[PDB]
Amino acid sequence: VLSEGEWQLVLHVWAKVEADVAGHGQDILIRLFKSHPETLEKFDRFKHLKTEAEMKASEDLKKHGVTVLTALGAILKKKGHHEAELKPLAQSHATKHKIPIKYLEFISEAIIHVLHSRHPGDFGADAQGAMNKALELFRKDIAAKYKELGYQG
Numbered sequence: 001v002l003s004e005g006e007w008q009l010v011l012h013v014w015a016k017v018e019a020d021v022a023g024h025g026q027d028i029l030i031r032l033f034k035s036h037p038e039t040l041e042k043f044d045r046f047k048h049l050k051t052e053a054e055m056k057a058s059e060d061l062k063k064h065g066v067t068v069l070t071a072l073g074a075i076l077k078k079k080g081h082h083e084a085e086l087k088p089l090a091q092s093h094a095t096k097h098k099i100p101i102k103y104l105e106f107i108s109e110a111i112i113h114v115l116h117s118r119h120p121g122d123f124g125a126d127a128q129g130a131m132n133k134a135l136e137l138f139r140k141d142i143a144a145k146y147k148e149l150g151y152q153g
């Protein structure tokens with residue numbers, strides 16, 4: 001798991017995200033969809049977006065990026081004790097949206113990339129390592145719930 005020093009790194013970086021939730025959210029979803037256009041196919045809501053310029057122009061996509069980062073932030077702030085927050089998310093993503101764990105890996109890479117792009121000075125390799133560990137813990141706990149419900153992978 002994460003050391004206290006590592007949680008400190010994660011939580012101090014997150015405060016920088018909270019200074020511009022919509023901007024980070026929009027950048028992360030666009031990075032995901034450009035890097036892995038197969039992920040776009042899971043969203044009936046967005047699958048009509050064919051080009052990067054169309055994604056940037058979508059107010060609805062920006063709104064969902066706020067939804068995603070708000071939910072992720074609430075989880076990170078629980079410092080590993082996130083069972084009540086994580087369970088409804090695992091439920092809906094396994095049983096309704098049908099999102100494979102690999103796509104959670106892809107969005108984790110997108111988050112790291114955008115944090116680096118927006119915060120090149122402050123987001124050094126130690127914070128990157130710590131953020132990677134936090135996102136791994138998130139995936140590990142979701143995967144456990146997926147396995148319980150008989151989805152896993």
Ligand code: HEM
Pocket residue numbers: 039040042043044045067068069071072088089092093097099103104107
């Ligand atoms: C950081 C990881 C993620 C977080 C925190 C997250 C959070 C959420 C939240 C809070 C909702 C709305 C409530 C719900 O339906 O559960 C949602 C909806 C959804 N999510 Fe996720 N999500 C994440 C990753 C993904 C990925 C990687 C995909 C697909 C590749 C995905 C697909 C969806 C879809 C299809 C919906 C329904 C959207 C709609 O039609 O309104 N999510 N997400």
Ligand SMILES: [Zn+2]
Pocket residue numbers: 035036037038
């Ligand atoms: Zn891909």
Ligand SMILES: [Zn+2]
Pocket residue numbers: 059062
């Ligand atoms: Zn706008």
